[PDB]
């Protein structure tokens, strides 16, 4: 039904994040692009709430979620974990930061997934809908490292759009830390504001042209499948989808509410 568990850190990012490392149990094993829910009683008894593993199953402790309050459930765990930690600057004490009870249940598995088992892809996020391939970029790095003979992907492209310029610091040092170990170029990183970051990667403004894109990976890689990854909104699924059938680009049809504009 469910493992019982605690937050043992947490963070508070810009433009509302609330980052938060859950102790992982023994027998919790995992994908990199999988999703749970999780309860938090002192929150809600009764109400679980779906997010994104922002970690990757290498990391052995800790489950990482990057949770977004956007509303009433995510306001008060913010509001939660903010004021238990305001207390404790003040206070000093063991008593101000009790410790923060969770259920967990998952792994749920998802589409995103077969990007290992892909030659080309593409992987196109908006605002904290780049979760699933913050997971996904990590693990990829460590199956490099530990064995790069058994996987078959040869180029990933990467797209990851916000509104906000300080959402990118959510994953700056991910993306640091790619730019400076991709000596073979196996990502393509672009970064749109809808170097500037301070990356090497220059962040582009305004809405990406999709077309142009689509054009020019279809010329890189034919007459190879390219498969494409989304986690976004419908204006834009709209438009990535017509392009997949325009370029005969791989393409699973999904929706993520979350994001809508
Ligand atoms: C597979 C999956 C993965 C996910 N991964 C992540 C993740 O990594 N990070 C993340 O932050 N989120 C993720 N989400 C979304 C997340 O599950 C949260 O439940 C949701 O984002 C917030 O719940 P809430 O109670 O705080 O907000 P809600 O109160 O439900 O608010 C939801 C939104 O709907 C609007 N709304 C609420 N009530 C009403 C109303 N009565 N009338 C009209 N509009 C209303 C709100 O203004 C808000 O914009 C994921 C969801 C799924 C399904
Ligand atoms: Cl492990
Ligand atoms: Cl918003
Ligand atoms: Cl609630
Ligand atoms: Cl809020
Ligand atoms: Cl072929
Ligand atoms: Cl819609």
Known sequence: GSEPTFVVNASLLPSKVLGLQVQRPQSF?????????????????????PFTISSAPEMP??????????GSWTGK??????????????SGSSQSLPGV??????????????????????LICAGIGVTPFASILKSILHRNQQNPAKMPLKKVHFYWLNREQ???????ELLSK????????????????????????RTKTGRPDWEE???????????????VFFCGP???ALQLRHLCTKYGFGYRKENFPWLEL
């Open 29 to 49: 094993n995992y994908q990199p692009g999988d999703y749970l829910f999780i309860k938090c009683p002192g929150i809600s008894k009764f109400e679980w709430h």
């Open 61 to 70: 402790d800790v489950l990482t979620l990057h949770i977004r309050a956007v």
């Open 77 to 90: 765990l913010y509001q939660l974990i903010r004021e238990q930690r305001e207390e404790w600057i003040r």
């Open 101 to 122: 009870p969770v259920y967990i249940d998952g792994p749920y598995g998802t589409p995103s997934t077969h990007i290992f088992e892909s030659k080309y892809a593409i």
């Open 166 to 172: 300080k959402a990118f610091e959510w994953f700056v």
């Open 178 to 201: 790619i730019e400076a170990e991709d000596t073979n170029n196996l990502f393509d990183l672009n970064l749109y504001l809808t170097l500037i970051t301070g990356l090497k990667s």
């Open 213 to 227: 894109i689509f054009k020019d990976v279809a010329k890189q890689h034919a007459p190879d499948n390219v498969e």
């Open 234 to 236: 419908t204006g834009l």
